[PDB]
Symmetry: D2
Subunit: 493 residues, 4 copies
Amino acid sequence: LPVLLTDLKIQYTKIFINNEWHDSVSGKKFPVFNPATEEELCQVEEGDKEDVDKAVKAARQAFQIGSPWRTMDASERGRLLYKLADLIERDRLLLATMESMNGGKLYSNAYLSDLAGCIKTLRYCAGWADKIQGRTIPIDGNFFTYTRHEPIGVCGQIIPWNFPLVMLIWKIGPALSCGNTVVVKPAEQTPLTALHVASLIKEAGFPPGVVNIVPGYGPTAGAAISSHMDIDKVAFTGSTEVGKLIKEAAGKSNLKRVTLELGGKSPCIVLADADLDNAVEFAHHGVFYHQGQCCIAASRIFVEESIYDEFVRRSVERAKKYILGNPLTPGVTQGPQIDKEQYDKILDLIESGKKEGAKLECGGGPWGNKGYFVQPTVFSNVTDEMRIAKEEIFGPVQQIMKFKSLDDVIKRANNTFYGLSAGVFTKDIDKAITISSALQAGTVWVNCYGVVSAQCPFGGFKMSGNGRELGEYGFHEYTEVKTVTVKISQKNS
Amino acid sequence: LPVLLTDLKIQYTKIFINNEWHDSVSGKKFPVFNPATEEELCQVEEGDKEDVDKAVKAARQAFQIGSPWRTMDASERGRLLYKLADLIERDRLLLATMESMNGGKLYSNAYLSDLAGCIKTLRYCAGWADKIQGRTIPIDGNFFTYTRHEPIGVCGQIIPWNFPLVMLIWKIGPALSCGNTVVVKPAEQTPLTALHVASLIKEAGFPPGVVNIVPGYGPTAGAAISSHMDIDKVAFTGSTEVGKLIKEAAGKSNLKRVTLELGGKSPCIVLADADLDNAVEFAHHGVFYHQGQCCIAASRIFVEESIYDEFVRRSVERAKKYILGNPLTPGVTQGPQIDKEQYDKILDLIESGKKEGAKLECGGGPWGNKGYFVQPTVFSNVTDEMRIAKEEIFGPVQQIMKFKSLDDVIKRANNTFYGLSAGVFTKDIDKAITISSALQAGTVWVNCYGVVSAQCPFGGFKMSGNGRELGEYGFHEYTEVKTVTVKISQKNS
Amino acid sequence: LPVLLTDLKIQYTKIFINNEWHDSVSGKKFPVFNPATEEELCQVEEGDKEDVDKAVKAARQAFQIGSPWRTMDASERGRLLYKLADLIERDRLLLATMESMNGGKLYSNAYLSDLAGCIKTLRYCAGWADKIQGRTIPIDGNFFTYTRHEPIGVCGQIIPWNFPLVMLIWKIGPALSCGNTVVVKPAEQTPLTALHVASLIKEAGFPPGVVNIVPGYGPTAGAAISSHMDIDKVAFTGSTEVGKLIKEAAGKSNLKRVTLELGGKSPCIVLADADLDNAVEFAHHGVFYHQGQCCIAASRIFVEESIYDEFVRRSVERAKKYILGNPLTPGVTQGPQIDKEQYDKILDLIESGKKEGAKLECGGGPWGNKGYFVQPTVFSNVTDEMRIAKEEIFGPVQQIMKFKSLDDVIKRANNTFYGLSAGVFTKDIDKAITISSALQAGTVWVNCYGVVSAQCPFGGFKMSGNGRELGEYGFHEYTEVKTVTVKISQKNS
Amino acid sequence: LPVLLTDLKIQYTKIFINNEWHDSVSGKKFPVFNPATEEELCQVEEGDKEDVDKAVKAARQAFQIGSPWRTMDASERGRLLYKLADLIERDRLLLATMESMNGGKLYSNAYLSDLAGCIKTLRYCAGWADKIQGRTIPIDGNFFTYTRHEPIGVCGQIIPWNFPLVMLIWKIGPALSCGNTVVVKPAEQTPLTALHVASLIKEAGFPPGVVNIVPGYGPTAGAAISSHMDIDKVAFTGSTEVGKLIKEAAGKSNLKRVTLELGGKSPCIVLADADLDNAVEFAHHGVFYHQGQCCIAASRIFVEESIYDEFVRRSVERAKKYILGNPLTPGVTQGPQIDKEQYDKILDLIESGKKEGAKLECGGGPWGNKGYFVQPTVFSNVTDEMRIAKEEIFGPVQQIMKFKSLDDVIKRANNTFYGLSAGVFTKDIDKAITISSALQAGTVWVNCYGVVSAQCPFGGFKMSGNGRELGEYGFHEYTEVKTVTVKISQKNS
Ligand SMILES: NC(=O)C1=CN([C@@H]2O[C@H](COP(=O)(O)OP(=O)(O)OC[C@H]3O[C@@H](n4cnc5c(N)ncnc54)[C@H](O)[C@@H]3O)[C@@H](O)[C@H]2O)C=CC1
Ligand SMILES: CCOC(=O)CSc1nc2c(sc3ccccc32)c(=O)n1CCCN1CCCC1
Ligand SMILES: [Cl-]
Ligand SMILES: [Cl-]
Ligand SMILES: [Cl-]
């Protein structure tokens, strides 16, 4: 685990449009904080509607028929993405450090996981660019018919603060591989890594206007994207509330394409025949990863009665082993929550668990004199009507419940408006296949949890979102299909 | 062209839920009219929110894990669809007659085209059922990963009055082939053919609740579908206004998947080297088909100056050759518009063309003492800011314009919030390919127009809709992708 | 289980070329026998080189650019195949009876399985016809590139006597769906069902020359196919010896495409945790089905030592329960072998098992005064160097062996030049996945055996064959891919 | 056009097995010559059967279940290929020089085209590695069925001398991306660039035994590959004669999979409406490229009578403009033929053209005192029965013919046992589509020629070969499909 042997210096703080750095139209700036210390790191240019309009015009122009980005070989779009991955690999120490400092994110994970994921995802996407293909189709009648899987056009992409870099790359990788242009709005909490990447987009040689990055707030810059009359598509990861607003704003304006990923209340089902240590470990990391701030957090763990008490005991032992503190310091194993709102939400929900009669096994309160820290918290004997069993907490708060009827537990697992993911732990082939088939969730892990890769599509059932990202299947959502049908004198098979 | 040698008798007038005929919960009924005579044909049970709730419950139950429709072989879903096609072929005379009588639709077209399209589309969809496949994916790490392309669940499907049968089958064919269950709301104007088909769904042996048909109005039954908390997806063909309302209602409620097809203002570009007679014929039929009531109507025809006057002359000669009257009577070549609202809209727009200075070549007024008839109408020297050049008329009203700059005409062709289709007429390979690539439209025809087939995906760019129907690509929109990732001791390629 | 309530009368005994019945050029005929009685059923026209030349010319002409079969809609090729399935369904009683009488095949299986498989396979193939698609490809440079998945042309198809109808349809279904024309040579033992199907091909309305059926012998009619200078592809199921000759003859002549399926020595691995009754049943039916005359026969069954004796006991009990006799008589559960050569081969191999020291548990000799009957025979304590462990027997002869090292048994399972299929019986997810991945076989069944369907590709690893039949993947082998690359002035994504 | 600013020094002259350099078992070496000077460049270790056996054992071991190459992530196979491309880019000057010196290949083409093609092809193949996917399949009955697209195993790959590097990469890129191991036999004429690449395979970090390179002769090392009992597949580009021998040897031994590309007699059809200068240029380069030593050489050019004389005149003017000499010297535009056999064959065929009455427009004899040089030669009024119209010349010899019947010229174009490629020159859409559809050739170029890219599949119809290389479609030929079918208690769609 190498580190930056020199203190981080913040350089890139401006709006990125047509490969140059812009002041906000208003002249306004907003502060950016270190969640572990509550101290301002810097000021960043505050994008708003006016700045979004500049970025959209730039993106529109870069998408015009005859432009460099429309006319270059697909393989060259791919080359540019591979180059960007190489640049991020070059600046890995710097990026992992900035990510950890701005995002409250453990540095070892930032370096070994987030940065690795960004690099691998970009390289995966680079490979698709010249492998996006349409069809030739044996239509009835004397016609030649083919399809073009064109890029859609200008894609507005709004990303959250929990995985700033990974989410940036998850959005831009596919969009660019397919030939789109993008207007990106990073989370107000975490604009800095996106702006560094923008410098590397310029360095790699992407044509101007192909990627534009507009830091700013949700109701301002975000809303301007969702309601813009010349944005063809909007992609978003974040809260359900905002997802609704985005879909509504898209409907009112220009009926732009919308894809959403909106978190979850993801269940695990642990059968009595399960490898118990393996289930405890994966379910543990499954809920606690990055201070509980994962859309896929395994926030309801149902365990067969006969192994329930043992499951709970071992889970508690594991949760009691964390070291809280600054995510930069080696050996520290839990960083802060991102901000006050999240902090407040986690505490309120923890209090509801105590009130509504859940058994507190450990944690249950805040930690320290600075930083938005929350003790890792475990509740057992949780019941389905409790707030901590229904609401996404997005904090280090684990719920453990028992069942003895498998039919009943699948119904309980499914009894939510969410549906992002689930986990099944068993040694039995038939149970693994039939349970995974019955769960209304986008990804089901069997005898593991939290395994996400560029090669697999990822997305929600129900209110956890719509559409899929990554894999072969995800690329479909960044193309617009055109059918071309040509009259011919006579066809032959 | 065979005919029913016995008078049509209306039998099926009720709400279809769980394969039985239901009265409306309210007890209310609404009238159904023959647009050619303005006479009531019958009364039909009026579905509203309460009836939609009954259909959704039925559809939900038919979709449950372990149900007949979830557990039957995919090939058997396909068999059921093939059987339904055979039944519609059996009742072709009856259906074509009912379609023509209720829809104001020329009987020869109803029989030879609409009914043929329904049959062929169903058979096409039947073939996909056991050919819907997921993937196995060489994910990083020691895992086995596969995907399931599951049906989504309960699909709400709202269809228009212009092609009642074709649109019914365009919706239910793919949805059912993929294993979904459906709640269908036919247009208030044209419920009758859908209800006959429902009798044939029962006869074919589809499990109850797999298809439910709820006749009724837009703001009542339609709105209940779009806002329902247990409908997983809504599909819609109709007006832009309603498309917006549907997307908004889906966002406010349960973030259900939405696909829309919303008509157009589709352009043709006729180059000087074009086969002129061929371009005139296809552009003519392209705008005039079914009294102009096609989403893809070729409602802006741009012709190179040197052949413009000849194009206009020949177009006028062709338009002056129609025989208006009852769509049932042989040799009649133009039926009525569907209803008063459409009628009023076409007349108002025709008047705006005269006012704003378009040259009237023929038609321009109503026809007859009964029926919503409009003279076939041609305007030349139309300019881009005129109402008849911007608004979808949905009537027998042709606009012809000239150009001499090809760069300019492509920009004019593209200068619309619509984008459903377009036509290009030229003998030159390079022009055909480059022009079709540059047009922002879902289907581009070359040296033809209006060629739609079950084998090709169909849908809009921009505000003409989102998603694609039919072809291989259309089937994707009726599946929900689940990734299953299984921990293994060691993988091997 | 319905039966023909009228005695079978043989009608179709001639060579089928251009949809008419032909005498052999030589005037020669050959006899056809009932294997259960050794009595001649009829005489059939003997095709030889001269007749093959007539069929190839007919097939070539039907494949010419501009012909009905090249110009008809793909959906119409599909319609024709669906019609043929409907006709075979109509004549199911007759076909199942003829199959059983000519092939020595149990009538209940013939009716319920073989005929069902033919019908289902044809319907599956019908569905692909208009779903065979090429690609459009974003090649480097200013070009438009697309591919056509054309039919190959004249396909020579040689099929065996064990599943005459199923194999006929397995060959012609895909070939025709893809638009090829075919020259079929049924086994000399079993020409009759193929000739009836030919009458139904004529009745369904296939254009003449699209299917031609040339009964005759291997070294005569078969060899003429394999060496023909105007046959584009040859497909074959049968013996390894002949497979070699076919590949060699194809290399010497016109380098025609070759696909082979050549039987096996397929292993099962039964782990100690397996559902034992389920493993015994499937392994039993897996080797004994159709008198052992299946390419996929489970002819080496390795059982973990701790359950080996119990496995063997239960296997023996099951084998001792058969009733031998005429395949037409209800309750009869084992018919004859096909002919004297097979009969002789099975007996010789059974004798080698006794000689080389295998433990005879039951059977071991012939049965009856007429018909090529062999007692169902079980050997335990078989070792890998014995003839019955290495050679495909193609008779009712089961080999059971023990193991205790899993690494070792996989190596033993794989230690063969064959590789058609295998079976794995265990309750453990990891073992099921890792073992199936390690076995060098085309199809691996888990906790079942002998499950073959039109939707899955089927074919061998190693010397069990090359290429795959059926599924999506099998269709690729009946197309020839053409790339078309068109110079354009400027491309756009 | 940069050059090596230092003289080339030959380093790598040994057999490459398990990532180390081996002497031949016999101790024998063979000489390697510069075709431009007829001087020996070096000696290279001569591989024979014994050495092939060592390489196959190494390849077999590297392919074993549990090996590094079988267990590494697919994305890592891709990474290794990307690294190799980067290494070849690093050594581009050296490789382009060695290629030109050993292969008689113009240095500017070697550098700008061959080396670029190698790099781009490797990068294309790298991108597929983790995008090779099987299927999940909705089989009839209560089963879970999926497929694995496994690597085949040990692939023997025999390549020719005309494009040593490009062909090496065309073979190993796909084979390795798919996870195979390879035993490569470069042409005896041109082993040197392959051995340098082998050093870069070692440097990139490929596991030992994954690639093995065995220089040597055809009937010795080549024959040992084709007849080997433990090689799973053989791929070959070269002469028809050898293709036959390979297919036969594969049939006699172990029925290994075979794919062949075998050159052609590729036709162009130039219509009267064609852009004439464009057709002349592409047809010219189409036959003359790399001294006529391209499988796709446009060796029959049919021109409509009305433009035939002009076509011939302009073609002659272009052919008379070459500068012969050393392929290393700037401004030199034609190098030597590869060796004496080719040289002799070209001269003999040129003499047959004079004898049989073809009109000699220019060239017709040898050139210089050393090097296998042949004057660029044009024949007009060539007729279909002449040797130069039927036999692949593989020299700088152009045939031009006239036609006036389009039906007739397509039949003439098709009247060959070859079918690798063809060209069509016209401005008319319908002709371009219908002619290209009618030509029995693997690639058809329209208004261009010789446009080959990694993204498109490439291969012959008829005796020009079997199978396809590159594109998505080519990758299929380097996988072996396994179906896995698992019994489950109950399936759900
Ligand atoms: N799916 C996921 O991974 C995430 C889920 N969440 C959930 O949402 C809850 C609230 O967290 P927030 O930070 O408020 O998430 P949020 O959904 O409001 O913020 C995420 C992104 O949306 C933008 N945004 C906010 N308001 C917007 C608007 N009106 N229009 C357009 N864009 C807008 C933000 O600026 C940011 O870029 C969390 O407690 C958690 O449960 C939060 C972040 C990520
Ligand atoms: C290859 C893409 O990059 C990464 O995987 C970075 S890490 C990571 N990304 C995402 C999630 S949700 C999600 C949704 C979309 C895209 C990426 C992710 C997550 O939860 N994580 C931590 C897993 C730690 N795990 C602990 C045990 C196994 C992995
Ligand atoms: Cl498509
Ligand atoms: Cl998928
Ligand atoms: Cl292809």
